[PDB]
Structure 1
Amino acid sequence: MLDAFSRVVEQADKKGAYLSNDEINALQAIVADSNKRLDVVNRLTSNASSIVANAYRALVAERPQVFNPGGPCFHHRNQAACIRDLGFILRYVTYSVLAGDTSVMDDRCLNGLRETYQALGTPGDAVASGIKKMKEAALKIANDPNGITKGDCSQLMSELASYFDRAAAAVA
Protein backbone atom coordinates (compact mmCIF):
# COMPACT_ATOMS: atom_id res chain seq x y z
CA MET A 1 0.00 0.00 0.00
CA LEU A 2 1.28 3.46 -1.00
CA ASP A 3 0.00 7.06 -0.95
CA ALA A 4 0.69 10.26 -2.92
CA PHE A 5 3.72 11.06 -0.75
CA SER A 6 5.16 7.60 0.01
CA ARG A 7 5.20 6.96 -3.74
CA VAL A 8 7.51 9.87 -4.59
CA VAL A 9 9.74 8.87 -1.65
CA GLU A 10 10.00 5.40 -3.16
CA GLN A 11 11.05 6.99 -6.47
CA ALA A 12 13.72 9.06 -4.69
CA ASP A 13 15.22 6.07 -2.85
CA LYS A 14 15.48 4.04 -6.08
CA LYS A 15 18.11 6.56 -7.20
CA GLY A 16 19.66 7.10 -3.78
CA ALA A 17 18.98 10.83 -3.81
CA TYR A 18 16.95 13.19 -1.64
CA LEU A 19 13.58 14.58 -2.73
CA SER A 20 14.37 17.44 -5.14
CA ASN A 21 13.07 20.98 -4.62
CA ASP A 22 10.65 20.63 -7.55
CA GLU A 23 9.30 17.47 -5.90
CA ILE A 24 8.90 19.17 -2.51
CA ASN A 25 6.78 21.79 -4.26
CA ALA A 26 4.71 19.12 -6.05
CA LEU A 27 3.55 17.46 -2.83
CA GLN A 28 3.25 20.97 -1.38
CA ALA A 29 0.44 21.50 -3.90
CA ILE A 30 -1.26 18.29 -2.74
CA VAL A 31 -1.40 19.60 0.84
CA ALA A 32 -2.68 23.02 -0.28
CA ASP A 33 -5.86 21.47 -1.71
CA SER A 34 -6.22 18.76 0.96
CA ASN A 35 -9.36 20.43 2.32
CA LYS A 36 -11.04 20.08 -1.10
CA ARG A 37 -9.67 16.54 -1.43
CA LEU A 38 -11.17 15.57 1.92
CA ASP A 39 -14.56 17.09 1.04
CA VAL A 40 -14.56 14.86 -2.04
CA VAL A 41 -13.70 11.81 0.09
CA ASN A 42 -16.39 12.81 2.56
CA ARG A 43 -19.24 13.41 0.11
CA LEU A 44 -18.76 9.99 -1.50
CA THR A 45 -18.64 8.28 1.90
CA SER A 46 -21.94 9.88 2.91
CA ASN A 47 -23.80 9.29 -0.36
CA ALA A 48 -22.22 5.83 -0.69
CA SER A 49 -25.42 3.77 -0.49
CA SER A 50 -27.34 5.98 -2.94
CA ILE A 51 -24.64 5.87 -5.63
CA VAL A 52 -24.34 2.05 -5.75
CA ALA A 53 -28.12 1.56 -5.51
CA ASN A 54 -28.92 3.84 -8.45
CA ALA A 55 -25.95 2.43 -10.39
CA TYR A 56 -27.52 -1.00 -9.90
CA ARG A 57 -31.02 0.21 -10.78
CA ALA A 58 -29.84 1.87 -13.99
CA LEU A 59 -27.72 -1.17 -14.89
CA VAL A 60 -30.67 -3.56 -14.61
CA ALA A 61 -32.78 -1.06 -16.54
CA GLU A 62 -30.13 -1.09 -19.26
CA ARG A 63 -29.50 -4.84 -19.15
CA PRO A 64 -32.64 -6.69 -17.98
CA GLN A 65 -31.45 -10.05 -19.38
CA VAL A 66 -28.57 -10.34 -16.92
CA PHE A 67 -30.82 -9.95 -13.87
CA ASN A 68 -33.60 -12.31 -15.03
CA PRO A 69 -34.16 -16.12 -15.00
CA GLY A 70 -31.26 -17.34 -17.11
CA GLY A 71 -28.94 -14.39 -16.75
CA PRO A 72 -25.77 -14.60 -14.59
CA CYS A 73 -27.10 -12.21 -11.93
CA PHE A 74 -30.39 -13.93 -11.02
CA HIS A 75 -31.33 -15.12 -7.49
CA HIS A 76 -31.24 -13.04 -4.29
CA ARG A 77 -27.88 -14.69 -3.66
CA ASN A 78 -26.37 -13.12 -6.80
CA GLN A 79 -28.53 -9.97 -6.73
CA ALA A 80 -27.06 -8.84 -3.41
CA ALA A 81 -23.59 -9.98 -4.51
CA CYS A 82 -23.67 -7.52 -7.43
CA ILE A 83 -24.56 -4.47 -5.31
CA ARG A 84 -21.90 -5.51 -2.80
CA ASP A 85 -19.25 -5.61 -5.55
CA LEU A 86 -20.09 -2.15 -6.88
CA GLY A 87 -19.89 -0.99 -3.28
CA PHE A 88 -16.37 -2.44 -3.12
CA ILE A 89 -15.16 -0.51 -6.18
CA LEU A 90 -16.58 2.73 -4.77
CA ARG A 91 -14.94 2.14 -1.39
CA TYR A 92 -11.48 1.74 -2.90
CA VAL A 93 -12.03 4.68 -5.24
CA THR A 94 -12.68 6.74 -2.10
CA TYR A 95 -9.54 5.25 -0.50
CA SER A 96 -7.52 6.39 -3.51
CA VAL A 97 -8.81 9.97 -3.41
CA LEU A 98 -7.72 10.07 0.24
CA ALA A 99 -4.24 8.72 -0.49
CA GLY A 100 -3.93 10.61 -3.76
CA ASP A 101 -2.67 7.28 -5.09
CA THR A 102 -4.23 4.33 -6.92
CA SER A 103 -2.13 1.54 -5.32
CA VAL A 104 -4.65 0.45 -2.65
CA MET A 105 -7.27 -0.12 -5.34
CA ASP A 106 -4.87 -1.90 -7.72
CA ASP A 107 -3.71 -4.41 -5.08
CA ARG A 108 -6.64 -5.03 -2.73
CA CYS A 109 -9.25 -4.89 -5.50
CA LEU A 110 -8.30 -4.78 -9.20
CA ASN A 111 -5.44 -7.31 -8.78
CA GLY A 112 -7.15 -10.44 -10.07
CA LEU A 113 -10.69 -9.10 -10.43
CA ARG A 114 -10.61 -9.53 -14.21
CA GLU A 115 -9.94 -13.28 -13.93
CA THR A 116 -12.38 -13.64 -11.03
CA TYR A 117 -15.47 -12.38 -12.89
CA GLN A 118 -14.28 -14.42 -15.87
CA ALA A 119 -14.02 -17.69 -13.92
CA LEU A 120 -17.55 -17.07 -12.61
CA GLY A 121 -19.21 -16.07 -15.86
CA THR A 122 -19.86 -12.40 -15.10
CA PRO A 123 -20.31 -10.22 -18.26
CA GLY A 124 -17.52 -7.84 -17.26
CA ASP A 125 -18.86 -5.30 -19.76
CA ALA A 126 -21.87 -5.10 -17.43
CA VAL A 127 -19.77 -4.42 -14.34
CA ALA A 128 -17.89 -1.70 -16.24
CA SER A 129 -21.22 -0.10 -17.15
CA GLY A 130 -22.17 -0.21 -13.48
CA ILE A 131 -18.99 1.69 -12.63
CA LYS A 132 -19.47 4.29 -15.38
CA LYS A 133 -22.91 5.12 -13.97
CA MET A 134 -21.57 5.01 -10.44
CA LYS A 135 -19.12 7.65 -11.71
CA GLU A 136 -21.67 10.10 -13.17
CA ALA A 137 -23.33 10.29 -9.77
CA ALA A 138 -20.10 10.47 -7.76
CA LEU A 139 -19.04 13.54 -9.73
CA LYS A 140 -22.43 15.25 -9.31
CA ILE A 141 -22.48 14.65 -5.54
CA ALA A 142 -18.82 15.36 -4.77
CA ASN A 143 -19.01 18.57 -6.82
CA ASP A 144 -22.17 20.24 -5.51
CA PRO A 145 -22.02 24.05 -4.91
CA ASN A 146 -24.43 24.00 -1.95
CA GLY A 147 -23.17 23.49 1.59
CA ILE A 148 -19.50 24.08 0.76
CA THR A 149 -17.13 27.05 0.45
CA LYS A 150 -17.00 28.21 -3.17
CA GLY A 151 -13.88 27.49 -5.17
CA ASP A 152 -12.42 25.31 -7.90
CA CYS A 153 -11.86 21.73 -6.74
CA SER A 154 -11.20 20.95 -10.43
CA GLN A 155 -8.14 18.68 -10.47
CA LEU A 156 -9.96 16.53 -7.91
CA MET A 157 -12.77 15.71 -10.35
CA SER A 158 -10.25 14.85 -13.09
CA GLU A 159 -8.45 12.60 -10.60
CA LEU A 160 -11.76 11.16 -9.35
CA ALA A 161 -12.57 10.41 -12.99
CA SER A 162 -9.22 8.69 -13.55
CA TYR A 163 -9.90 6.37 -10.61
CA PHE A 164 -13.37 5.33 -11.77
CA ASP A 165 -12.21 4.91 -15.38
CA ARG A 166 -9.23 2.90 -14.15
CA ALA A 167 -11.50 0.50 -12.25
CA ALA A 168 -13.97 0.01 -15.12
CA ALA A 169 -11.20 -0.75 -17.62
CA ALA A 170 -9.66 -3.27 -15.22
CA VAL A 171 -12.70 -5.56 -15.50
CA ALA A 172 -13.97 -5.10 -19.06
Structure 2
Amino acid sequence: SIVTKSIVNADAEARYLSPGELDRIKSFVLSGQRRLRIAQTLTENRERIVKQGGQQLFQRRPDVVSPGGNAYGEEMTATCLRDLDYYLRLVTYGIIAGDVTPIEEIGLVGVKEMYSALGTPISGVAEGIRCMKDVACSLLSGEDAAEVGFYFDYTLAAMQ
Protein backbone atom coordinates (compact mmCIF):
# COMPACT_ATOMS: atom_id res chain seq x y z
CA SER A 1 0.00 0.00 0.00
CA ILE A 2 0.96 3.66 -0.05
CA VAL A 3 1.10 3.63 3.74
CA THR A 4 3.57 0.78 4.07
CA LYS A 5 6.12 1.83 1.44
CA SER A 6 5.98 5.50 2.35
CA ILE A 7 7.07 4.20 5.75
CA VAL A 8 9.77 1.81 4.56
CA ASN A 9 11.09 4.57 2.31
CA ALA A 10 11.50 6.96 5.23
CA ASP A 11 12.53 3.98 7.36
CA ALA A 12 15.64 3.31 5.27
CA GLU A 13 16.62 6.98 5.22
CA ALA A 14 16.89 7.10 9.04
CA ARG A 15 14.27 9.84 9.16
CA TYR A 16 10.60 10.44 9.81
CA LEU A 17 8.03 11.17 7.12
CA SER A 18 8.11 14.52 5.36
CA PRO A 19 5.04 16.65 4.63
CA GLY A 20 5.28 15.19 1.15
CA GLU A 21 4.79 11.76 2.70
CA LEU A 22 2.32 12.74 5.43
CA ASP A 23 0.15 14.92 3.22
CA ARG A 24 -0.50 11.87 1.06
CA ILE A 25 -1.20 9.32 3.72
CA LYS A 26 -3.64 12.04 4.73
CA SER A 27 -4.74 12.43 1.13
CA PHE A 28 -5.04 8.67 0.67
CA VAL A 29 -7.25 7.95 3.69
CA LEU A 30 -9.72 10.63 2.64
CA SER A 31 -9.62 8.87 -0.74
CA GLY A 32 -10.48 5.60 1.00
CA GLN A 33 -14.24 6.04 0.78
CA ARG A 34 -14.06 6.34 -3.00
CA ARG A 35 -11.69 3.38 -3.34
CA LEU A 36 -14.02 0.90 -1.65
CA ARG A 37 -16.82 1.93 -3.99
CA ILE A 38 -14.60 1.23 -7.00
CA ALA A 39 -13.47 -2.14 -5.67
CA GLN A 40 -17.08 -2.87 -4.73
CA THR A 41 -18.03 -2.53 -8.39
CA LEU A 42 -15.47 -5.08 -9.55
CA THR A 43 -16.21 -7.42 -6.64
CA GLU A 44 -19.63 -8.65 -7.77
CA ASN A 45 -19.00 -8.16 -11.47
CA ARG A 46 -16.44 -10.96 -11.68
CA GLU A 47 -19.02 -13.15 -13.41
CA ARG A 48 -19.17 -10.77 -16.34
CA ILE A 49 -15.69 -9.27 -16.14
CA VAL A 50 -14.08 -12.71 -16.23
CA LYS A 51 -16.44 -14.48 -18.62
CA GLN A 52 -16.49 -11.59 -21.06
CA GLY A 53 -12.78 -11.26 -20.32
CA GLY A 54 -12.17 -14.73 -21.71
CA GLN A 55 -14.67 -13.84 -24.43
CA GLN A 56 -12.35 -11.48 -26.29
CA LEU A 57 -9.28 -13.48 -25.29
CA PHE A 58 -10.31 -16.51 -27.34
CA GLN A 59 -11.56 -14.40 -30.24
CA ARG A 60 -8.18 -12.67 -30.30
CA ARG A 61 -6.06 -15.75 -29.51
CA PRO A 62 -7.80 -18.87 -30.86
CA ASP A 63 -4.46 -20.71 -30.87
CA VAL A 64 -4.39 -21.07 -27.08
CA VAL A 65 -7.80 -22.75 -27.05
CA SER A 66 -7.49 -24.63 -30.36
CA PRO A 67 -6.24 -28.24 -30.24
CA GLY A 68 -2.60 -27.88 -29.30
CA GLY A 69 -3.13 -24.64 -27.43
CA ASN A 70 -2.30 -24.63 -23.75
CA ALA A 71 -5.92 -24.03 -22.72
CA TYR A 72 -7.48 -26.74 -24.87
CA GLY A 73 -10.50 -28.76 -23.78
CA GLU A 74 -13.01 -28.46 -20.98
CA GLU A 75 -10.28 -28.77 -18.38
CA MET A 76 -7.64 -26.17 -19.28
CA THR A 77 -10.24 -23.60 -20.38
CA ALA A 78 -11.68 -23.68 -16.86
CA THR A 79 -8.20 -23.03 -15.50
CA CYS A 80 -7.81 -20.66 -18.45
CA LEU A 81 -10.47 -18.49 -16.81
CA ARG A 82 -9.24 -19.27 -13.29
CA ASP A 83 -6.10 -17.16 -13.73
CA LEU A 84 -8.16 -14.23 -14.97
CA ASP A 85 -10.22 -14.52 -11.80
CA TYR A 86 -6.93 -14.37 -9.89
CA TYR A 87 -5.63 -11.26 -11.63
CA LEU A 88 -9.02 -9.59 -11.43
CA ARG A 89 -8.88 -10.23 -7.70
CA LEU A 90 -5.42 -8.71 -7.31
CA VAL A 91 -6.56 -5.56 -9.08
CA THR A 92 -9.23 -5.19 -6.41
CA TYR A 93 -6.44 -5.41 -3.85
CA GLY A 94 -4.34 -2.80 -5.63
CA ILE A 95 -7.26 -0.39 -5.83
CA ILE A 96 -7.87 -0.62 -2.09
CA ALA A 97 -4.18 -0.55 -1.24
CA GLY A 98 -3.65 2.40 -3.57
CA ASP A 99 -0.66 0.69 -5.17
CA VAL A 100 0.43 -2.42 -7.07
CA THR A 101 2.30 -3.68 -4.01
CA PRO A 102 -0.34 -6.42 -3.53
CA ILE A 103 -0.17 -7.12 -7.26
CA GLU A 104 3.62 -6.93 -7.12
CA GLU A 105 4.40 -9.79 -4.73
CA ILE A 106 1.39 -11.81 -5.93
CA GLY A 107 1.09 -12.65 -9.60
CA LEU A 108 3.90 -10.41 -10.82
CA VAL A 109 7.19 -11.30 -9.13
CA GLY A 110 8.65 -14.20 -11.07
CA VAL A 111 5.52 -14.60 -13.16
CA LYS A 112 7.53 -15.33 -16.30
CA GLU A 113 9.20 -18.27 -14.58
CA MET A 114 5.84 -19.85 -13.75
CA TYR A 115 4.17 -19.43 -17.12
CA SER A 116 7.32 -20.38 -19.02
CA ALA A 117 7.54 -23.46 -16.79
CA LEU A 118 3.87 -24.28 -17.38
CA GLY A 119 4.16 -24.05 -21.16
CA THR A 120 1.68 -21.18 -21.21
CA PRO A 121 2.30 -18.33 -23.64
CA ILE A 122 2.91 -15.37 -21.33
CA SER A 123 1.90 -13.02 -24.14
CA GLY A 124 -1.42 -14.84 -24.29
CA VAL A 125 -2.23 -14.21 -20.64
CA ALA A 126 -1.27 -10.58 -21.18
CA GLU A 127 -3.90 -10.44 -23.92
CA GLY A 128 -6.42 -11.84 -21.45
CA ILE A 129 -5.88 -9.07 -18.92
CA ARG A 130 -6.25 -6.42 -21.61
CA CYS A 131 -9.62 -7.88 -22.59
CA MET A 132 -10.69 -7.72 -18.95
CA LYS A 133 -9.60 -4.08 -18.81
CA ASP A 134 -12.02 -2.97 -21.52
CA VAL A 135 -14.85 -4.75 -19.72
CA ALA A 136 -13.86 -3.26 -16.37
CA CYS A 137 -13.50 0.34 -17.55
CA SER A 138 -16.81 -0.01 -19.40
CA LEU A 139 -18.47 -0.57 -16.01
CA LEU A 140 -17.29 2.69 -14.44
CA SER A 141 -17.26 6.41 -15.11
CA GLY A 142 -14.35 8.29 -16.63
CA GLU A 143 -12.92 9.34 -13.29
CA ASP A 144 -12.89 5.73 -12.12
CA ALA A 145 -11.85 4.18 -15.44
CA ALA A 146 -8.59 6.12 -15.18
CA GLU A 147 -7.89 4.08 -12.04
CA VAL A 148 -9.29 0.58 -12.67
CA GLY A 149 -7.74 0.53 -16.10
CA PHE A 150 -4.62 2.07 -14.58
CA TYR A 151 -3.82 -1.04 -12.54
CA PHE A 152 -4.48 -3.44 -15.41
CA ASP A 153 -1.94 -1.83 -17.72
CA TYR A 154 0.69 -2.03 -15.00
CA THR A 155 -0.04 -5.75 -14.90
CA LEU A 156 0.22 -5.72 -18.68
CA ALA A 157 3.62 -4.03 -18.47
CA ALA A 158 5.11 -6.42 -15.92
CA MET A 159 3.67 -9.43 -17.80
CA GLN A 160 5.95 -9.12 -20.82
The TM-score normalised by the length of structure 1 is 0.85
**C-alpha distance in 2, partners of 1:167/1:99?**
15
* Gaps in structure 1 of 5+ consecutive residues: 144-152
Paired residue for 2:135, among 120, 137, 141?
137
Q: Is this contact kept in 1: 2:100–2:151, CA < 8 A?
A: yes
From 161, 165, 169, the counterpart of 2:149: 161
Q: Which amino acid aligns with 1:66?
A: V
**Does the Cα contact within 8 Å between 2:136 and 2:149 map onto a contact in 1?**
no
The question of 1:67 aligning with 2:65 is answered yes
Q: Which residue, out of 18, 21, 38, partners 1:20?
A: 18
Alignment length, in residue pairs?
160
Distance 1:73 1:16 in 2: 50
Alpha-carbon separation, structure 2, partners of 1:102 and 1:71: 30
Secondary structure of the 2:138 match is: helix
How far apart, in 1, do the equivalents of 2:63 and 2:15 lie? 57
User: Partner amino acid for 1:92?
Assistant: L
Shift of 1:142: 3.3
**Per-residue deviation at 1:171?**
2.5
Residue 23 of structure 1 and its aligned partner are, at CA, apart by: 2.0
Q: 1:111 aligns with which of 93, 109, 112?
A: 109
Cα deviation for residue 97 of structure 1 reads: 0.6
Q: Which has the higher contact order (CA 8 A, sep 6+)?
A: 1
Does residue 57 (structure 1) correspond to residue 45 (structure 2)? The answer is no
Shift of 1:70: 1.9
Alignment of 1:41 onto 2:39 = yes
Q: Match of 1:142, SS?
A: coil
Say whether the 8 Å CA contact 1:44–1:142 is kept in structure 2.
no
